[PDB]
Design a protein around this ligand. Structure first.
Ligand SMILES: CC(C)(COP(=O)(O)OP(=O)(O)OC[C@H]1O[C@@H](n2cnc3c(N)ncnc32)[C@H](O)[C@@H]1OP(=O)(O)O)[C@@H](O)C(=O)NCCC(=O)NCCS
Ligand SMILES: CC(C)(COP(=O)(O)OP(=O)(O)OC[C@H]1O[C@@H](n2cnc3c(N)ncnc32)[C@H](O)[C@@H]1OP(=O)(O)O)[C@@H](O)C(=O)NCCC(=O)NCCS
Ligand SMILES: NCC[C@H](N)C(=O)O
Ligand SMILES: NCC[C@H](N)C(=O)O
Ligand SMILES: [Mg+2]
Lengths: 166, 164
């Protein structure tokens, strides 16, 4: 085998990341331009996984502007062909080592009910680090547009990763 | 008639903002969830305009994480009903005068060449302030997906606003 390689995205990755997100089904697809922005302005806090030249994983995240100790994790995707190999866990652990994630004391993310593997990713991460997790309302189904059905997006708060140091 | 009123967005505005952008038929439409995140996490650098209870304008923007003296302006939309009344100018100048924009020295934004009104919004902002504008390559058409056809998105850099 050929090991999966991990790196930050670039603007040029935007199309291929877009294609990865669209091919999941279970994520809400943003514009290609959005993923170029993430690769450009936000790439210090995002991650790509590649295998034999193909993008097989992506995480988008950003530090909250008002609450910078919080990293919001937006989308996590691994290509169908490459699931259950530890790529998402490796991307999340690797994201949290990045220089721009120094000092992050909480992760926030929303995980619906049908994103069952995603729930195990995030709650398993908290377990393995022996860190608390809590779930609040997040964005309910009612907030979404009329005339299609979206699941609730409850908010997971994972942390604190480290103590308040006097 | 009734004055347009301006405010920061909130997460709950995400659907209505999505619908405004959709209805333009001419902006890259993101997910409804994206606009909820903008209203939640980025609201200090965004804005809404409303008239008689309807959302008629939106800007999204954020300060660049690496280069926080730069405000990136992502999307600007005004409902077709309400165009050419100065709502976009009012949203932009209002935005730049908000607390969260103190210390911004540059605006960055992309403006495709057929978007004549957007070009005028940004270049007119620079011109009224007597501040430089510069255009560089941005995101060319070739970056966008196969089988779709997108205009180039050249990058406008407006500034510096001041020289401290
Ligand atoms: C969430 C997602 C990114 C996980 O990526 P991944 O690389 O396969 O995940 P990993 O291999 O790193 O596994 C992370 C955790 O979830 C668990 N897990 C992942 N996929 C699972 C599955 N299908 N069944 C059971 N457990 C699973 C792993 O066992 C691991 O938990 P553990 O730490 O208790 O060992 C991936 O499933 C994805 O993109 N899914 C979208 C499709 C989808 O879930 N659709 C649901 C609607 S049909
Ligand atoms: C770009 C947009 C936000 C401008 O909003 P607006 O509220 O109508 O703009 P304002 O009234 O504040 O005017 C801003 C500048 O644009 C000019 N302008 C706006 N619409 C114009 C048009 N149809 N004709 C020529 N000038 C135009 C104004 O004269 C003003 O320039 P000035 O300062 O030289 O006088 C709006 O056209 C819009 O939402 N368009 C749809 C979204 C988009 O950009 N789609 C892609 C393009 S087809
Ligand atoms: N965590 C995922 C949240 C939302 N469903 C999205 O795809 O952006
Ligand atoms: N400035 C607009 C850039 C892009 N066309 C979008 O709609 O996001
Ligand atoms: Mg142009």
């Amino acid at each position: 085998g050929t090991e999966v390689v991990y790196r930050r995205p670039e603007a040029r990755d935007g199309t291929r990341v877009w294609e990865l997100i669209r091919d999941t089904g279970s994520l809400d697809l943003n514009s290609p331009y959005c993923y170029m922005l993430l690769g450009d302005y936000f790439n210090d806090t995002c991650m790509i996984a590649e295998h034999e030249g193909d993008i097989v994983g992506f995480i988008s995240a950003f530090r909250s502007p008002r609450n910078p100790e919080t990293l919001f994790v937006w989308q996590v995707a691994v290509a169908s062909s490459h699931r259950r190999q530890g790529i998402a866990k490796a991307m999340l652990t690797g994201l949290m080592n990045q220089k721009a994630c120094h000092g992050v004391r909480f992760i926030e993310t929303t995980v619906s009910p049908s994103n069952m593997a995603s729930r195990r990713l995030f709650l398993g991460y908290a377990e393995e680090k022996s860190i608390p997790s809590t779930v609040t309302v997040g964005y309910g189904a009612e907030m979404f547009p009329d005339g299609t059905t979206h699941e609730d997006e409850p908010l997971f708060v994972i942390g604190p990763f480290f103590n308040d140091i006097g």
